[PDB]
């Protein structure tokens, strides 16, 4: 009956993210991807756009589901009967802040955080950098799920 | 007679800050906590409210006083006859930026900076993260002085 | 049927280690502590001494067992039908090397590594520093399992 | 035919930047300082002011030129027939972000990035921190080229 | 005419090293790989064997040559009319120590050091870890040049 | 009655160390340089040589004294009625290890550790790297006090 939550803003989800999802799904009975949107800064995609892109990318993971959340991440995790978070590490990760959030989350609700390093091929993509490169005409297609890539072109052509 | 300045925005003061204050007060004859506002941010608490919360938290430290400041930190320090800064290190501290400021402050005014690591129990609280957790209904009472936590719930309600 | 391996030299096991064991045991169905002794540098305790100290400390973890290993860690993990490693992070951890080993281990055998930050109270103990402090007469009793503490005094009084 | 681009916003150029420019100019046949502009963000100095400050402080480097641009850095580099970037490292550099950008730039365009440590004397100045200290009256004259310092004081005193 | 030295013990050369060599050879007119032995370690391969493995791996790089050296690195560099070093960065690199050596080398001889990040695929191999994995029967063939991997299995058998 | 201990093996003392000694002496009433010896590891200089090199280079600091010791650092500190350590930070410092030691020393004896960044000019010298460069004939004269340099050359030329 094990389980973990993979949280993030996922604007959009990248192959770095998907790699983390897959490993979480391989090692825990149940995985929930929590789409948690920053309230002070709306992004490129709407919440249900973000959710759809993740669902499309994770169709081959039977024990994974995708839900949006508001408020504390630890409440999202516990309200679903779990108490484990899985986060990815990549080139550019602010690991010090990850550690700060991990300790805070453990303190306030007893939720553990597990970190896993993303695959080297996907270690340098992030949502913001992929969007920036794409805005300026660069090819980030090898770093994003195919479904995301087309939607991203749409949002930019607009 | 020795002395140091403990600068920050303290919005609000945390037990991590208080740990640093106590260590500075134990090792220097005089400590001045300098409450310095970022001119384009305002924050949650007013300067007066911040000073009041620090004073209540440092009531047992007779050689420490609290004062607002504006302008260059090193001017604040030197104008009070001192030339040392004491800064805390916690989980999430941008240490590279602390080092850059320390080198800059030494270069422009000859002021030294001493860093001290906060206690493990208080190493993951920061003003911003405490406010964010509190905003969403999380309990950060063990990470803040008693006076702060009450005032915090007040600004949120 | 989930499971993870917690590897190390554990010379001796500390409360930092025990914290990691407990979280692994809370989040995976099955946990194995692998005692892997460096072949070029014997330590303070023998392998079976190290094992005994861990077993004594982990008696309240039903789904945890302790075994010694030789050769590749990834072979230890896979020969037991698992493919997940759990490692602790503390103050002083060479995280860059942990990342290097994690990527290598994933490359050569498809084994994932999950990192978890130890509790603040136990974040500054390590085997080597605890031994050094103890050698010079300092009190590290709050940082080690009670069983370990007495054995450590014995090895030093010798 | 070797060459490298030294990119940045240079608002304003510092002695840390100049140190890096000089290393690059000593080790590559040609160097181009790329003053990259976000057309949406103004900054303190106009693109012409930024270029003039750099040119005045690099006059003794005959193989270095200064050009502005926008959009992708790797496009600026490749359209000049080059595929190397030289970036400086200082105290306060977000090196993890530099690594991410270097890996991304290599991936999308085959462009290499070489990092060099700025000299100790110039290792704690940045454009933003110099601007901040000067705003509050601190003396940053030893950290900026002469082409910059009084121009900076002029911008600040003009509110 | 420009040039750089790529120094190391290369015991053995890895594809991470080779990636760095290729980038240096693409950007400088002349590259010299300097094989420098730690005088109290000997290692797995002799200096001659190390040079041979590098030469086989860099056969397509006509402006790169391989040479053993001893003594101060900056002397090796300056004696060959150059004053640049190129070093690779990988996962596990002690970057703080690289920076210290780079500053020292610039101070004592005016020699510059340029760092370049190795490709992601080759970012987690190192000479020591490859040998350790290979010793215990693990397959590191994708992380080493072909010539190296064969010679490696040989020294182990 | 304020005071701090500046500990280390100082084999030999560097200008980086001296910079830290000077900061400590300016900010605490008394400073003790603790030359800590492992009785099993010899090092290059004897304890008397290490102390003499430090004393010759600190003669202008009237509130600083030099004493050797072994065993726990916190015992050395507390037996002098103090409970502060001052440590320098330089390029190449293992800061994570410094933090671990600082937390351990606080835990076992209530002793505080204050870190200070060494001046840029002296930020890349360490005892071991200076010894290594000098061994191979490099010029480290600008990174060591005069009390050290020729003594170092003497040790090396004596094989
Ligand atoms: C949702 C939450 C976890 C997001 O935090 P986060 O882990 O730092 O991740 P974010 O969504 O902000 O985004 C950072 C990401 O890094 C990248 N990233 C994250 N995971 C990645 C991965 N596996 N691979 C590649 N890149 C990744 C980016 O994609 C993205 O950054 P970018 O915008 O620069 O591209 C956090 O804000 C949260 O918990 N919110 C709920 C409120 C709360 O509980 N607050 C108290 C916290 S203690
Ligand atoms: C067994 C092995 C994982 C040990 O590596 P390691 O994770 O770095 O851990 P180690 O046992 O060497 O010891 C480091 C530890 O850090 C500390 N430590 C480790 N985990 C800790 C924790 N959870 N809490 C507190 N401290 C901890 C120490 O206790 C100890 O160091 P110390 O001796 O300085 O006290 C590794 O060497 C290995 O895999 N060996 C098998 C051979 C192999 O597969 N090699 C190829 C690897 S890719
Ligand atoms: C222009 C570019 C090279 C950035 O240059 P940079 O030197 O790395 O950083 P910049 O020059 O833009 O920014 C200013 C620097 O950061 C500083 N800074 C100040 N506040 C900062 C903050 N909150 N965050 C980050 N940097 C800050 C400045 O002080 C300055 O430091 P410096 O004086 O030493 O140079 C990079 O943004 C780029 O390539 N843009 C083109 C678009 C592109 O190609 N994107 C894809 C990248 S993979
Ligand atoms: C003595 C003590 C303070 C260490 O001092 P330190 O300045 O932090 O480091 P040391 O002086 O011993 O060691 C030499 C330094 O590391 C260097 N060094 C060289 N090779 C090194 C290596 N392989 N690893 C680590 N350091 C190395 C030296 O160059 C030197 O740097 P520096 O010149 O800038 O000072 C610490 O070991 C101690 O407190 N010992 C007493 C016993 C004790 O209390 N133990 C409990 C500690 S919690
Ligand atoms: C006041 C001053 C010392 C900054 O203080 P600081 O402690 O280093 O930084 P702050 O006071 O803002 O504190 C950091 C805090 O900001 C908040 N914060 C949130 N997000 C942040 C972010 N992205 N960046 C910075 N701070 C952030 C708090 O979380 C946080 O930590 P803390 O609560 O544990 O202290 C500095 O700005 C200063 O000297 N100002 C005077 C002007 C001057 O002299 N400038 C020249 C300096 S060389
Ligand atoms: C030759 C020299 C450049 C060192 O090279 P380096 O690449 O920085 O370090 P090495 O060549 O040993 O390479 C590091 C390698 O050591 C091995 N290694 C294993 N454990 C190690 C450890 N704890 N520390 C260092 N290296 C280790 C390899 O794993 C490893 O990485 P790599 O295979 O990816 O390159 C340097 O020692 C030198 O300049 N020597 C000449 C003398 C001199 O001039 N000294 C003054 C320098 S300022």
Author numbering:
A (entry chain C), C (entry chain C): 1 to 158
B (entry chain B), E (entry chain B): 1 to 157
D (entry chain A), F (entry chain A): 1 to 159
Question: How is this structure described in the published paper?
Answer:
In this study, we explore M. abscessus phosphopantetheine adenylyl transferase (PPAT), an enzyme involved in the biosynthesis of Coenzyme A, as a target for the development of new antibiotics. Phosphopantetheine adenylyltransferase (PPAT or CoaD) catalyses the penultimate step in the biosynthesis of CoA in prokaryotes. The enzyme catalyses the reversible transfer of an adenylyl group from ATP to 4′-phosphopantetheine (PhP) to yield 3′-dephospho-CoA (dpCoA) and pyrophosphate.
Previous studies on E. coli PPAT have shown that Coenzyme A (CoA), the end-product of the biosynthetic pathway, acts as feedback inhibitor of the PPAT enzyme catalyzed reaction. To further understand the binding mode of CoA, we determined the crystal structure of Mab PPAT in complex with CoA. CoA and the enzyme product 3′-dephospho CoA (dpCoA) differ only by the presence of a 3-phosphate on the ribose ring. On the contrary, the adenosine moieties of CoA and dpCoA do not coincide in the Mab PPAT active site. The adenine ring along with the 3′-phosphate group of CoA is found largely exposed to the central solvent filled channel in Mab PPAT-CoA structure whereas in Mab PPAT-dpCoA, the adenine ring adopts a different position near the catalytic Arg90. Further, the adenyl moiety of CoA exhibits high B-factors in comparison to that of the dpCoA complex, suggesting greater movements of this moiety in CoA-bound Mab PPAT. This could be attributed to the steric hindrance in the molecule imparted by the additional phosphate group of CoA. Whereas in apo, PhP-bound and CoA-bound PPAT structures, the solvent channel adopts an open conformation and has a predominantly negative charge distribution from the acidic groups like Asp-94 and Glu-96 that are exposed to the channel.
